[PDB]
Ligand binder design. Structure first.
Ligand SMILES: Nc1nc2c(ncn2[C@@H]2O[C@@H]3COP(=O)(O)O[C@H]3[C@H]2O)c(=O)[nH]1
Ligand SMILES: Nc1nc2c(ncn2[C@@H]2O[C@@H]3COP(=O)(O)O[C@H]3[C@H]2O)c(=O)[nH]1
Lengths: 123, 125
């Protein structure tokens, strides 16, 4: 599972912003354009990779959408939706660029863990 | 496009933190499925990647990099065999070298890691 560090949670939250999403609501659809990533801080997000694949359940501290964030014109690999009332850190393209500028070391450590996760990965 | 290519800054800094390696035409650098914790940058010649099955070979010329998965992911097994098509020269960057690089220039590394992710999401033959 994902899981940010405490330092990441605090900083991504400050550079990004919070987003509330109700039980049953869609955050984005599979195959859609999307340039922001998200961190679950309360509740649960379900990822739907289409076809007959297992759903992934993401609880507090887990992140997703970094591909949309990091790769231009990426199409969302899964649909994202809220299982229950949830709250998220939403981090946009510009926010991430700011973060890299202010704290490249922390970002490098994050990107590194991302790569490990993403080569793991793909149902 | 979708070919690697380091920046000039990367080439110089990866060269300095790492070391150089000569490899003769026909020689294997590593086998597919093996343990491997270093990455490589081609600076002369050409490295061929063999992904097994019936997949196309990939040909990497000067300035192209490979093996970063082995470098970044513990207990990764090499996704391809690597071998020299012609006499080649490489920058070899070891695990410890990369950690030194991160510590001295995190910003350069972050930019590199970012470019890696794009390449890798656009990979797998
Ligand atoms: N493609 C893929 N994406 C995954 C997987 N597990 C989690 N994800 C995340 O699901 C996300 C959906 O949005 P993106 O396409 O932006 O980024 C994706 C990944 O960050 C997986 O196994 N495969
Ligand atoms: N998995 C994968 N690796 C690739 C591809 N093209 C180039 N590579 C590189 O091939 C390398 C084989 O060694 P590694 O797995 O160390 O690291 C890998 C990458 O740097 C591709 O299409 N798929």
């Amino acid at each position: 599972h994902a899981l940010m560090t405490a330092e990441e949670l605090a900083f991504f939250a400050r550079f990004g912003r919070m987003r509330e999403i109700a039980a049953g609501q869609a955050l984005f659809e599979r195959g859609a354009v999307g340039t922001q990533m998200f961190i679950v801080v309360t509740g649960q997000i379900d990822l739907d990779f289409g076809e007959d694949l297992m759903l992934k359940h993401l609880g507090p501290g887990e992140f997703f959408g970094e591909l949309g964030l990091l790769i231009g014109d990426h199409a969302r690999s899964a649909g994202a939706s809220a299982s229950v009332d949830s709250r998220l850190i939403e981090l946009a393209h510009d926010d991430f660029q700011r973060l890299v500028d202010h704290d490249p070391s922390m970002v490098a450590h994050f990107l590194r863990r991302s790569i490990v996760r993403v080569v793991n990965n793909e149902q």
